[PDB]
Write a protein that binds this DNA or RNA. Structure first.
Ligand SMILES: [Mg+2]
Ligand SMILES: [Mg+2]
Ligand SMILES: [Mg+2]
Ligand SMILES: [Mg+2]
Ligand SMILES: [Mg+2]
Ligand SMILES: [Mg+2]
Ligand SMILES: [Mg+2]
Ligand SMILES: [Mg+2]
Ligand SMILES: [Mg+2]
Ligand SMILES: [Mg+2]
Ligand SMILES: [Mg+2]
Ligand SMILES: [Mg+2]
Ligand SMILES: [Mg+2]
Ligand SMILES: [Mg+2]
Ligand SMILES: [Mg+2]
Ligand SMILES: [Mg+2]
Ligand SMILES: [Mg+2]
Ligand SMILES: [Mg+2]
Ligand SMILES: [Mg+2]
Ligand SMILES: [Mg+2]
Ligand SMILES: [Mg+2]
Ligand SMILES: [Mg+2]
Ligand SMILES: [Mg+2]
Ligand SMILES: [Mg+2]
Ligand SMILES: [Mg+2]
Ligand SMILES: [Mg+2]
Ligand SMILES: [Mg+2]
Ligand SMILES: [Mg+2]
Ligand SMILES: [Mg+2]
Ligand SMILES: [Mg+2]
Ligand SMILES: [Mg+2]
Ligand SMILES: [Mg+2]
Ligand SMILES: [Mg+2]
Ligand SMILES: [Mg+2]
Ligand SMILES: [Mg+2]
Ligand SMILES: [Mg+2]
Ligand SMILES: [Mg+2]
Ligand SMILES: [Mg+2]
Ligand SMILES: [Mg+2]
Ligand SMILES: [Mg+2]
Ligand SMILES: [Mg+2]
Ligand SMILES: [Mg+2]
Ligand SMILES: [Mg+2]
Ligand SMILES: [Mg+2]
Ligand SMILES: [Mg+2]
Ligand SMILES: [Mg+2]
Ligand SMILES: [Mg+2]
Ligand SMILES: [Mg+2]
Ligand SMILES: [Mg+2]
Ligand SMILES: [Mg+2]
Ligand SMILES: [Mg+2]
Ligand SMILES: [Mg+2]
Ligand SMILES: [Mg+2]
Ligand SMILES: [Mg+2]
Ligand SMILES: [Mg+2]
Ligand SMILES: [Mg+2]
Ligand SMILES: [Mg+2]
Ligand SMILES: [Mg+2]
Ligand SMILES: [Mg+2]
Ligand SMILES: [Mg+2]
Ligand SMILES: [Mg+2]
Ligand SMILES: [Mg+2]
Ligand SMILES: [Mg+2]
Ligand SMILES: [Mg+2]
Ligand SMILES: [Mg+2]
Ligand SMILES: [Mg+2]
Ligand SMILES: [Mg+2]
Ligand SMILES: [Mg+2]
Ligand SMILES: [Mg+2]
Ligand SMILES: [Mg+2]
Ligand SMILES: [Mg+2]
Ligand SMILES: [Mg+2]
Ligand SMILES: [Mg+2]
Ligand SMILES: [Mg+2]
Ligand SMILES: [Mg+2]
Ligand SMILES: [Mg+2]
Ligand SMILES: [Mg+2]
Ligand SMILES: [Mg+2]
Ligand SMILES: [Mg+2]
Ligand SMILES: [Mg+2]
Ligand SMILES: [Mg+2]
Ligand SMILES: [Mg+2]
Ligand SMILES: [Mg+2]
Ligand SMILES: [Mg+2]
Ligand SMILES: [Mg+2]
Ligand SMILES: [Mg+2]
Ligand SMILES: [Mg+2]
Ligand SMILES: [Mg+2]
Ligand SMILES: [Mg+2]
Ligand SMILES: [Mg+2]
Ligand SMILES: [Mg+2]
Ligand SMILES: [Mg+2]
Ligand SMILES: [Mg+2]
Ligand SMILES: [Mg+2]
Ligand SMILES: [Mg+2]
Ligand SMILES: [Mg+2]
Ligand SMILES: [Mg+2]
Ligand SMILES: [Mg+2]
Ligand SMILES: [Mg+2]
Ligand SMILES: [Mg+2]
Ligand SMILES: [Mg+2]
Ligand SMILES: [Mg+2]
Ligand SMILES: [Mg+2]
Lengths: 77, 10, 46
RNA sequence: AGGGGCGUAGUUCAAUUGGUAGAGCACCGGUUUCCAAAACCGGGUGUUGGGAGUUCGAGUCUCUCCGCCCCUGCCA
RNA sequence: CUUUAAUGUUUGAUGUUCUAACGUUGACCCGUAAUCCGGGUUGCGGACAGUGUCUGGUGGGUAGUUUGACUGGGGCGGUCU
RNA sequence: AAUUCCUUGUCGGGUAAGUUCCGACCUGCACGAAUGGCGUAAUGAUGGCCAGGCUGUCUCCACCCGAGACUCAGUGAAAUUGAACUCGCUGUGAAGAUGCAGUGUACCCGCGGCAAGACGGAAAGACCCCGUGAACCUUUACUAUAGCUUGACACUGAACAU
RNA sequence: UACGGUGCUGAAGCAACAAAUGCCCUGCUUCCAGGAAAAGCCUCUAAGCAUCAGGUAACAUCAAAUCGUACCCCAAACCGACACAGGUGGUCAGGUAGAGAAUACCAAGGCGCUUGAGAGAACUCGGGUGAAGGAACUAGGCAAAAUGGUGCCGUAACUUCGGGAGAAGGCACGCUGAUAUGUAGGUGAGGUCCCUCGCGGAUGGAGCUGAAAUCAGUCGAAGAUACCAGCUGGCUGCAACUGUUUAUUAAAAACACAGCACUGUGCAAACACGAAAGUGGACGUAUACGGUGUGACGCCUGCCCGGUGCCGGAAGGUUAAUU
RNA sequence: CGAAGGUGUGCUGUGAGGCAUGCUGGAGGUAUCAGAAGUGCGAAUGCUGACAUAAGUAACGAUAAAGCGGGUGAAAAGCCCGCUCGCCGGAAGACCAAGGGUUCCUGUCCAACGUUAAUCGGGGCAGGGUGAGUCGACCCCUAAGGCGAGGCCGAAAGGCGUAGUCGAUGGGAAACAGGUUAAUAUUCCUGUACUUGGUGUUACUGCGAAGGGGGGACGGAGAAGGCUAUGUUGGCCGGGCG
RNA sequence: UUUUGUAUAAUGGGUCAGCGACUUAUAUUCUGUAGCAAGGUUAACCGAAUAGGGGAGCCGAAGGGAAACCGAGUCUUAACUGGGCGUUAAGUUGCAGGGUAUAGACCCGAAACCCGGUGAUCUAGCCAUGGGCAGGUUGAAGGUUGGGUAACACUAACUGGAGGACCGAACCGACUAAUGUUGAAAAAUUAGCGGAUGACUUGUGGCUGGGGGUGAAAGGCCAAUCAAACCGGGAGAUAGCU
RNA sequence: UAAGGUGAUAUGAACCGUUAUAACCGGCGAUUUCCGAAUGGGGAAACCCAGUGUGUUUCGACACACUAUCAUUAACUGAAUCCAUAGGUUAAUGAGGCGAACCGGGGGAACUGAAACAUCUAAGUACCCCGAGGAAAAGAAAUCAACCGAGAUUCCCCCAGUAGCGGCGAGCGAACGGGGAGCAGCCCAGAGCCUGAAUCAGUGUGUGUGUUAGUGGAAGCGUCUGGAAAGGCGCGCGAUACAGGGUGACAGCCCCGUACACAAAAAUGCACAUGCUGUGAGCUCGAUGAGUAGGGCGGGACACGUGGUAUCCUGUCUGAAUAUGGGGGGACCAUCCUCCAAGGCUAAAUACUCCUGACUGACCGAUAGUGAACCAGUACCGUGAGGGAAAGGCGAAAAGAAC
């Protein structure tokens, strides 16, 4: 499903407004993209379904550090 | 049941 | 004149039988309701 | 019947819409042609349907009255 | 100050060429007894396509509703201070 | 004319007599060319009209054969029903009277029949109207919205040329 | 001997002809719309065994479990609230007449339909017949009556040459005899030849079966005698047609239709169903697919781009998020 | 020594009521003054039950048709037996599938059920009855389709789908005739067969796959030919002399 | 009952018996009553506990002004001789009752909207696999053999067996009329009628689900219900109407 | 515990017991077919079909056991591709489903009200889905206050229908503060010096108190009416027992009980103590949660509907300071107070009752009370989901009527 494997972002629901404030139910989905991340330690490419916000944290945190948290989370990358 | 007898005065 | 009921044991069991009802949760909720109500005959199977 | 529109030169139409009515054709007169026409020059034409009211003043504004158009008169 | 000629800079506008993201409902290999899927090799495309947020346009495709009253029945006509 | 209001348009054919039909006329209220026009053999439980045959369709009904209806025995419903000792007439009267007034008539009670009335029975009227009722449907009614489409940013980088 | 029964005995048990919709036939011929799968079964070798195992063949032998099996099954037992004039798939298919599984009468077999008995009114239902007239009835020939078979003769406008057409209209039909005592035809024994020999071939014609036609005679009012079994013709509107539709008041001129045209769509197709994946389109590729309108065929389809859509253009005007 | 309740009677108050009694019944009832209410019914085409009305009226379910003798019985138009008559006979006969579930057979009974009576019944009651290597099902095999490891996708639920695994209405081994029970039969009995596996013996010996190939394996229409089921006639056998 | 008005021929009721509709909670105002009184009274809670404790708070004794503020005054205005609102007048807490408010709010009754499920054993379409269509006609293409042509073309005869072809049973449809209309039957029967080798018909399974399906298209059909199925829930929806 | 007993309709038959192996009651075990998460495969639930292994032999077979999926962990093997990795095969644990309400979270209406109707209301309600517990959730201040101070969370009464929100309509509706119920605080983001300290979790070991069978339990006679006395009329007695029920009409003394006094082989709850197995207490010095806070855009949650709107959550795009520093104090700034987010844990007061026991009612008394006082979620109806009834009383004793 539409779940970020790093940040855990999932679809959320909200309202479409209007000039008359009419409210209709809608959904907000993450900007998910399948990317092949190069993990140096295994000299391999591992594919992750990440959001655009998740991509930013990967550079800041390091590829190895995030995966360590993922193994603790048991997400089965 | 029934079917409204079309003895209808229009 | 042919009416709405044409008996067919194979069709009846495949449509409303115990295994057909219990295959899905919605049918399993029918069994849960009939168990809660205390029905003598849970499903249509003999 | 009821409601809207219309009546302006000889025929078809502009109108200004309170203070002095034009255009096209037709008609008349004169050119041109052997002659008619086509063409050219010049020009006269109107109670503005009828009446009664307003207004200093009405073809124009108001109301009836004639004539001619256009719409409606539907549900059981 | 104007006119500004040139000067670097900072943003953009196209065009061209790349590959490395991304695409492949191209080929081949393996998982594999498999027209799925995944991985690998390669080719093609390529900073497009596609997707997310925001945003302009369009949208009876689909919804939620409105569409007055008086009236010698109602509608039409007329009327509403 | 599946289209013509006036209208049974007018003329012709068919009939003794034809508001229909057929042929023309054109004055097309308000036909018309793929929301097709005009024709067209065949086809049609297709619509209209005419003729022959044929007949109880009818003039005008008669008889007969069966099944009910009628009588007897057995079994044994239903819709409906305020209560009834439940007549005519004229008038009155939520304005069409078995029930009021006046008057007339009528012994008590079945059975077979006919349906004029009991505003007969059936079903909180379908037409009409109303409610600031419901639902579907239409659109250049209103407000939205899926979808489609546009651009910015992100996924998304490099070099060069202007 | 208990109407049953039980026990014993028990003749002939052949041929010809006719003949299927069954079998050969999952064949043959032909056509376009081009007509499952898998396993059992047969065969082939890999790896893994090739002394073994395993395979083939012949005997002997074991095993073949479990569940259904009554009865109804076009109906009183199923579906219709009913012992309900309804509905319900397959198999079997006797005799006479007949083209026939139509129809009439019968066989095998099964039934008389679970209130009757009287009476013999009106009226109602289902039928029969009808003087005379023959659509005068009625919205309307509604209904009824009538036509009805085979063979032969004959048959118009019109036509897309197929039709129209069974057009219309008419004639002959029984029975008996003769041709010919039981014909033509079909079937076909015995016998006689031939065979590299059999469920054989060629002759051969016995015996069965058997129309159709003609002639002569004969009966009746009537010979397709019953049942069964087209009414016909003329003009015209609409739709070409076969078909489809409002189960339960509308079967039509409505829908569909072949054909025609426009338009979209280059295949990761358009489009559609799906929050998405995917699927259909299509295992198709513009001679294809989707959508729209028209609706065979024949002769044809004129003028308007102002309005509303669609398509193309992009210079300018205006204009969102953003900055 | 007769409470409530019910049913009469009498008295009494302006009224809703009250008091007392005779009978019924057979065990509860309750003054007074306060307190609390599911506190008072004729109607709502009110709800439930009971009972009327029409009314001993309509109807008693295809116009295929009945009649008689005898029997059983308390009782016979309806049951049993017999003889006639009539109806179906491409069905109104026979055998199945689907579906029903004992309605099948026998004994016994007539309250209810049967549109009447009923001795009868598909009614009540009690017994009995369904016998398979070959018929089916199960089993092997697949169609449409369903489910679906992993997988892909999706707020969750879930959706789709691969390998697979299910799913006949189709494809796959084999039995016929005769006899017999009140009710079953290609199942039981008699007679005569056949099939697929297991095991063992003997002889001869290349076997072998989730793999390959063949086969299974397939339309519509039409045309005959050869046949059988079956029928007819003759012959034969038995019986008949009307 | 509803009305200006009903013996009304306007609605309601066949009858009896039973049941059946102004309630409850909280808050607020008013009246009555009781207590205390310029004061009255507690709530939660504690508590052997209907006591007592708890004055947290609430109302009242002072108002005016938008407010700051002032205060028996105050506001307005620059200011009022003014004017508005106030100042002599007992309240408060229980209990009962009359109203109001929020809840279903006196009871019964919608057509509908929304949510989650159940249905394609009927019917519509489609998919897979099987079956059915007596009999009798018409005689296409093609083929053969002639006649004709240089070869065709063409023509004749004979073979052939084409068709949403013809007549007509089964089968399927349902056009007309009669009956039937509390029926034999909640759509049929009888006599006729159309199709009847096909766009046919049928058996057994399967698939498509409710704003959805399916539809040779009628708003038809989707379990006797369809201009939005059925079941349960929101729900005692709402009902200025009866 | 016992002199009676083989459940009920429901008799009968044949028997078993009587002083303790009848029966009955309780604790702990044994057995526990088939279906069902159903788990060897399949399936039209209660049926069909196996595989492996051990052990049996009458050579026909037979009896047990194991064989689902997923998650986690560990071994062994094992591609493209040399290592590897994916994948594959075993073995251990754990999970699957059901169940009333309450709880947290993910989604989320409409009717209705506004006398119409869009914002709003209904309502974060109904419903769907996920997860957990006996409670859950929340919870140890980047909180409030206001220059005085308070000191986690939850719940009740006030504050108050106030301040505010609102087509400023309908309506919605606090907080501060106060009174109560109940109170409890800690750990990591790191290393030493001490040392096993406190405390917690496992378990045994006793005590105490329950729970799951039980034991004893006081005291009346006469007469009258009457079918029968518990009633009438007399005369007694018990009471820590006059709560109730039954007994032929109304029983303190007839029976069962009640008040009191007692009881446990075995299992188990709770609490205290104690022993082991883990568990670390204290001191010093450090460290102080970054794609986070904040911001732009779009929404949502706070009573607060974008409004001048603080605060909280974030789909999107950005992005700090970091104790010499940050957050909040309802736009915003300064000053001043107060606190230290971006890591966690935590009992009590609170909500609910499918179920167990006892007791209570100005609650019902067979059309009432649960739909059901009765073999009721049954009969019956519907393809199905689902809907859903009617029906109690002989008498003291059946003595249920011999003939
Ligand atoms: Mg109308
Ligand atoms: Mg709309
Ligand atoms: Mg609404
Ligand atoms: Mg009005
Ligand atoms: Mg006319
Ligand atoms: Mg004429
Ligand atoms: Mg004409
Ligand atoms: Mg036209
Ligand atoms: Mg045109
Ligand atoms: Mg056109
Ligand atoms: Mg037709
Ligand atoms: Mg005609
Ligand atoms: Mg005639
Ligand atoms: Mg009368
Ligand atoms: Mg009278
Ligand atoms: Mg009168
Ligand atoms: Mg009479
Ligand atoms: Mg009569
Ligand atoms: Mg009459
Ligand atoms: Mg109105
Ligand atoms: Mg039998
Ligand atoms: Mg029948
Ligand atoms: Mg019926
Ligand atoms: Mg029945
Ligand atoms: Mg049939
Ligand atoms: Mg026949
Ligand atoms: Mg008669
Ligand atoms: Mg008649
Ligand atoms: Mg006749
Ligand atoms: Mg006669
Ligand atoms: Mg006559
Ligand atoms: Mg005559
Ligand atoms: Mg006439
Ligand atoms: Mg006449
Ligand atoms: Mg006729
Ligand atoms: Mg006739
Ligand atoms: Mg003709
Ligand atoms: Mg005409
Ligand atoms: Mg047609
Ligand atoms: Mg119809
Ligand atoms: Mg039909
Ligand atoms: Mg019809
Ligand atoms: Mg058309
Ligand atoms: Mg244009
Ligand atoms: Mg243009
Ligand atoms: Mg009482
Ligand atoms: Mg008395
Ligand atoms: Mg008694
Ligand atoms: Mg009451
Ligand atoms: Mg009353
Ligand atoms: Mg009655
Ligand atoms: Mg009688
Ligand atoms: Mg009568
Ligand atoms: Mg009578
Ligand atoms: Mg009668
Ligand atoms: Mg009968
Ligand atoms: Mg007799
Ligand atoms: Mg006969
Ligand atoms: Mg029985
Ligand atoms: Mg019998
Ligand atoms: Mg009797
Ligand atoms: Mg019986
Ligand atoms: Mg056998
Ligand atoms: Mg068996
Ligand atoms: Mg077989
Ligand atoms: Mg899976
Ligand atoms: Mg699937
Ligand atoms: Mg299988
Ligand atoms: Mg089969
Ligand atoms: Mg049998
Ligand atoms: Mg062929
Ligand atoms: Mg033969
Ligand atoms: Mg009346
Ligand atoms: Mg009435
Ligand atoms: Mg008071
Ligand atoms: Mg107190
Ligand atoms: Mg105070
Ligand atoms: Mg003053
Ligand atoms: Mg009050
Ligand atoms: Mg009230
Ligand atoms: Mg045909
Ligand atoms: Mg035909
Ligand atoms: Mg009639
Ligand atoms: Mg025809
Ligand atoms: Mg229907
Ligand atoms: Mg709707
Ligand atoms: Mg409902
Ligand atoms: Mg509600
Ligand atoms: Mg209601
Ligand atoms: Mg199993
Ligand atoms: Mg409203
Ligand atoms: Mg627990
Ligand atoms: Mg004791
Ligand atoms: Mg920190
Ligand atoms: Mg924001
Ligand atoms: Mg503002
Ligand atoms: Mg505002
Ligand atoms: Mg804000
Ligand atoms: Mg941020
Ligand atoms: Mg009673
Ligand atoms: Mg009740
Ligand atoms: Mg009850
Ligand atoms: Mg009762």
């Amino acid at each position: 499903s539409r779940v970020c494997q790093v940040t855990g972002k999932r679809p959320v629901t909200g309202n479409n407004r209007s000039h008359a404030l009419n409210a209709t139910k809608r959904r907000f989905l993450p900007n998910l993209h399948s990317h092949r991340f190069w993990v140096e330690s295994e000299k391999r490419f591992v594919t992750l379904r990440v959001s655009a916000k998740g991509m930013r944290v990967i550079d800041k945190k390091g590829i190895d550090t995030v995966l360590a948290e993922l193994r603790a989370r048991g997400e089965k990358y | 049941a029934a079917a409204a007898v079309r003895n209808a005065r229009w | 004149m042919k009416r709405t009921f044409q008996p067919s044991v194979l069709k009846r069991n495949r449509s409303h039988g115990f295994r057909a009802r219990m295959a899905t949760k919605n049918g399993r909720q029918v069994l849960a309701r009939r168990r809660a109500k205390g029905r003598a005959r849970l499903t249509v199977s003999k």
